Design a protein around this ligand. Sequence first.
Ligand SMILES: Cc1cc2nc3c(=O)[nH]c(=O)nc-3n(C[C@H](O)[C@H](O)[C@H](O)COP(=O)(O)OP(=O)(O)OC[C@H]3O[C@@H](n4cnc5c(N)ncnc54)[C@H](O)[C@@H]3O)c2cc1C
Length: 447
Amino acid sequence: MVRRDGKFVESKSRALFVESTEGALPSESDVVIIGGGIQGIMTAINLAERGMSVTILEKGEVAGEQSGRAYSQIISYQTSPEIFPLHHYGKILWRGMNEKIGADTSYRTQGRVEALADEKALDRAQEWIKTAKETAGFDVPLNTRIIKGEELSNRLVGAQTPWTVAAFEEDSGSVDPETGTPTLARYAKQIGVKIYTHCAVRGIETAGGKISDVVTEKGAIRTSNVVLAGGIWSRLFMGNMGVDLPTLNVYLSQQRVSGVPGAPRGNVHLPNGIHFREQADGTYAVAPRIFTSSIVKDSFLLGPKFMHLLGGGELPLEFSIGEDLFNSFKMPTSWKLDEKSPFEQYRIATATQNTEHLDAVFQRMKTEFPVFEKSQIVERWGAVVSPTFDELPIISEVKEYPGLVINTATVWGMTEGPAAGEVTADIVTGKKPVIDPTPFSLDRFKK
Ligand SMILES: Cc1cc2nc3c(=O)[nH]c(=O)nc-3n(C[C@H](O)[C@H](O)[C@H](O)COP(=O)(O)OP(=O)(O)OC[C@H]3O[C@@H](n4cnc5c(N)ncnc54)[C@H](O)[C@@H]3O)c2cc1C
């Protein structure tokens, strides 16, 4: 039967609290950034370090939404050719991040073992590793290989299933999302970025093809350069300017369980639906296999491109239908800049957690690794993501509105954030980007 429990709700941040910059909004800024997630913040840092004045506006709290809620494995494994450099260089930048900011983001190089279920999986793993090893950029080699026997069994200590082979990304990363983006926000503030929380951006004023200001709920700020890094809210923001972003929301759930003696370390991914990541604080992040699509207005508006999230393919997908459906039609898609926007109602949006999903993955984890019988649940939460239909982010200028640049629509933003932040800064400043952004352009959606 069809579920009725998936719901979009207002919530609170689960990430470390970041104080707003003191005082009034500035009257002008060289660049204004909409959103205080990892993309807004990493973009701000790259621009500030180039000597520009930068202001971030955040309707709720820093890392209140996706960036504070992520499973947060930092990996390149099985990425496409267009995406791989973003992940490969993301990892490079993360490895230098604590040094850069003189603080601990919680980033750790920990390694990731993915058990492979059969020869077909093994074939696909070896094929990707072969090509990635040959094409790895930025004068840094890939450190991903196949392992087996004694080596694998000790990596997967106490495992009840006879796993024989696995892809091992030895330099995979981990960052605890409660810690990472907030600590980067603090660094941003130290280098002169101004961050104003509880401050929604309603829209952008422009004429003659030049942006003149952004309008917030607390006043306007003059600028000719704007970055929209609004996460799931980017589509809605752009719809009010007559531009369509093809993104569809998906609901997820996550948890933390306590560490136990004799548990495997680092990052484990098994094909029988078991995925955990040891955190810097001793607890384990645990991710269920499944996602839910709550049926809403945009499910019909974007459906043809998104059939892999709406019943086609064999992704682990569950439909849900409820209050969301009717609310999605009541959600305004345009508003004047002098009236209240939907951003001022859902300052810290999330989805209701699915307890059944979280219980099921944890039980599967206890069966496969009996030491976790003595582990208990530390924390549980829900989250919303909003990918494009083509497995590519939107990192692009907006031709219609010179001065506007978008950096959004990724489900790998923890990994990509540092790299995407630099690319976005390059687009803003007119520098030849560190990674060619053609594949991430809005041009791919025209005609
Ligand atoms: C369950 C889950 C697991 C994940 N696991 C991984 C993983 O293992 N590895 C990985 O790399 N990535 C992962 N991600 C992805 C990563 O969390 C996101 O891609 C990334 O956080 C996106 O960052 P962002 O800055 O674009 O968006 P967000 O973090 O959502 O930031 C957007 C911010 O903009 C604000 N905002 C929006 N509109 C306005 C406005 N008009 N005015 C002012 N402020 C506004 C919002 O309040 C929000 O704080 C996961 C995500 C989820 C949900």
